[PDB]
């Protein structure tokens, strides 16, 4: 039926229905603007009024103004007639290529895969990125998390993965841009048309795009994470297919939450966040998963505010991943890209029974010398290298090489590194370190291992200097 | 020949592992080519029995809404409420 | 407990005219078929795409090395 706006503040609006009253989650439809202004019920305040989160600007609304119930959730296009199309948070298309004629629809909200549907299929997914492979490998159909503070190189890394992975990949990929840079989208689009994962000519397109960037209202950023969610969901279930879900940046989802939780009228929780940060997340999060039916390999970039890895946002999210890659400004500032913290990135499959105890052994051997170097880090800073015992003078030099040989010039920042984009296969990864560790190379300069491919390019470099 | 026998009990063990794999291949193929129908009949007996027990609904919403003689069996069973409770 | 044991019988005077009405799943309409094909794809997935009625032949492979 019909009801009216009685309160408006930011993205929170209060509608009064005399007849009937929409379930919590029903997309409402504002009647009176040149622009589809979906509200979304989130509360029943009583006195036959509901409280809703907008999905766009609310300049203009007035106390009065009619609203129609849609009788349903926000529902969007799903199916194969999405591949190649850019769609926004409510399904509307935004690549200015007409409408998205599609058989079926789905709602953005949805209960999550019951326990019986889970699958324990753990098979390694090689990236050709030395640190990731050697120390905390990604797992096929696993949840992956990229943690980073402003500017440490999440977006680059997600891109390199999209390249070393979703280019030679028989199967559908969905990319949800949640509250990041609009120009990064324009950039993706073009980059994927040229490379031809998207094709304007055909229906040979292998990717769907869902975008709600850092210029749109809380509501929109709040939700869009789920739009793109729903899409990937279909390709998994009604297609029992291999889905690749990339999000950037999942943080902006919790953030946007925070912006609204204030006026929804919850009482503030730790650090000002919404009371409901763990579940708000966890519902949404647990839908992103590989089930018996289909299979989603997820890769989410996670922003870390003020570099605070304990900020509730990043802090809570860790629970939800199977492999994590954590980026430190500290490292990046030493020109060690990709900026991966070797002692803080982990995978739930670094396990000899899964990766074969040559892998597991060279790993924890690097991970050891590094964390041995790291302990000396203090005495070296106050007294200097010389006060270091002879044994220890080495543990440094070797470690420092490892430190340097985990750097790897990506095929993207061929522009910042200038250097040619390498991709190193698990074998030569595992090998090279093993050698470095067994000190075949204590005769080579440090630099020799900074920014290279296999260990050859290392020993090779060392010559061109001499 | 010590450095030369770890490899002679590696090959005598790297074939023990491939000849065991081919023996569980046929299982993972054979028992599968029919455990399939274990499911092509599973979704079938249920789904049908969905529409079947659900079909019940729409024929009973037709029984009360229609049959003005199913408005008499209304006041009936219901006045047998007030009583018992007390 | 005496005006309720026979209302549970409005449920097999229909259960009856159903598990006997042969001629196809009753009154289906289009819906009935389409969906019984989508779940015919995904259930044809975890297993493979080959012939489910025949006994599979056998390609074999040598032992790799690390």
């Amino acid at each position: 039926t019909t009801g009216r706006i009685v309160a408006v503040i930011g993205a929170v609006v209060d509608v009064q229905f005399d007849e009937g009253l929409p379930p919590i989650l029903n997309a409402l439809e504002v009647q009176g603007r040149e622009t589809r202004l979906v509200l979304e019920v989130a509360q029943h305040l009583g006195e036959s009024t509901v409280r809703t989160i907008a999905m766009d600007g609310t300049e203009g609304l007035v106390r009065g103004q009619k609203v129609l119930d849609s009788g349903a959730p926000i529902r969007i296009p799903v199916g194969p007639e999405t591949l190649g199309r850019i769609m926004n948070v409510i399904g509307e298309p935004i690549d200015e290529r007409g409408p998205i004629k599609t058989k079926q629809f789905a709602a953005i909200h949805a209960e999550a895969p019951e326990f019986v549907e889970m699958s324990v299929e753990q098979e390694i997914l090689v990236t050709g990125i030395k640190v990731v492979d050697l120390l905390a490998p990604y797992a096929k159909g696993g949840k992956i998390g990229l943690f980073g503070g402003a500017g440490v190189g999440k977006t680059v890394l997600i891109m390199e993965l999209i390249n070393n992975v979703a280019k030679a990949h028989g199967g559908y990929s969905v990319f949800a841009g949640v509250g990041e840079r609009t120009r990064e989208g324009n950039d993706l689009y073009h980059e994927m048309i040229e490379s031809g994962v998207i094709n304007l000519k055909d229906a040979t397109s292998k990717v769907a795009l869902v975008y709600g960037q850092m210029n749109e209202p809380p509501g929109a950023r709040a939700r869009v994470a789920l739009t793109g969610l729903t899409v990937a969901e279909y390709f998994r279930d009604q297609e029992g297919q291999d889905v690749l879900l990339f999000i950037d940046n999942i943080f902006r989802f919790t953030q946007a939450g925070s912006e609204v939780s204030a006026l929804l009228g919850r009482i503030p929780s730790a650090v000002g966040y919404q009371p409901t940060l763990a579940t708000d997340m966890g519902t949404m999060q647990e839908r992103i998963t590989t089930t018996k039916k289909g299979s989603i390999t997820s890769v989410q970039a996670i922003y870390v505010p003020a570099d605070d890895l304990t900020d509730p946002a990043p802090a809570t999210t860790f629970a939800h991943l199977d492999a994590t890659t954590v980026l430190s400004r500290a490292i990046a500032e030493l020109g060690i890209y990709p900026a991966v913290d070797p002692l803080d990135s982990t995978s739930r499959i670094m396990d000899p029974n899964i990766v074969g105890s040559e892998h597991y052994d060279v790993a924890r051997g690097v991970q050891k010398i590094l964390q041995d170097y790291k302990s000396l880090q203090d005495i070296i800073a106050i007294l200097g290298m010389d006060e270091l015992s002879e044994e220890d003078k080495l543990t440094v030099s070797r470690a420092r090489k490892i430190q340097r040989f985990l750097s790897q010039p990506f095929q993207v920042a061929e522009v910042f590194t200038g250097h040619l984009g390498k991709l190193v296969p698990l074998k030569e990864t595992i090998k090279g370190f093993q050698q470095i560790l067994a000190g075949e190379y204590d005769h080579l300069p440090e630099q020799a291992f900074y920014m290279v491919g296999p260990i050859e390019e290392a020993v090779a470099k060392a010559d061109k200097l001499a | 020949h010590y450095l030369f026998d770890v490899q002679r009990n590696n090959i005598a063990m790297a074939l023990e592992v491939t000849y065991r794999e081919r023996l569980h291949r046929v299982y993972r193929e054979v028992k599968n080519r029919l455990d399939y129908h274990i499911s092509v009949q599973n979704m079938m007996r249920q789904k049908e029995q969905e529409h079947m027990i659900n079909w019940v609904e729409k024929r009973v919403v037709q029984s009360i809404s229609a049959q003005q003689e199913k408005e008499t069996i209304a006041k009936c069973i219901a006045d047998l409420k007030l009583l018992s409770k007390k | 407990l005496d005006p309720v044991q026979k209302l549970f019988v409005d449920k097999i005077r229909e259960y009856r005219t159903k598990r006997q009405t042969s001629g196809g799943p009753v009154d289906a309409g289009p819906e009935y078929q389409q969906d019984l094909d989508r779940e015919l794809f995904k259930l044809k997935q975890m297993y493979g795409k080959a012939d489910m009625n025949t006994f599979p032949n056998f390609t074999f492979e040598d032992p790799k090395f690390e």
């Binding site: 040559e358 052994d361 | 009990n9 074939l15 029919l34 | 006994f55 690390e66």
Partner: peptide
């Protein structure tokens, strides 16, 4: 070399029932 030595030590129904039934180191 020895790590590759320690991983290995650890390891119509009647048309299917009737149809159901490396040494160069002695050199180098």
């Amino acid at each position: 070399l020895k790590s590759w030595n320690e991983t290995l030590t650890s390891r119509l129904v009647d048309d299917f029932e009737k149809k159901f039934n490396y040494t160069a180191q002695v050199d180098a």
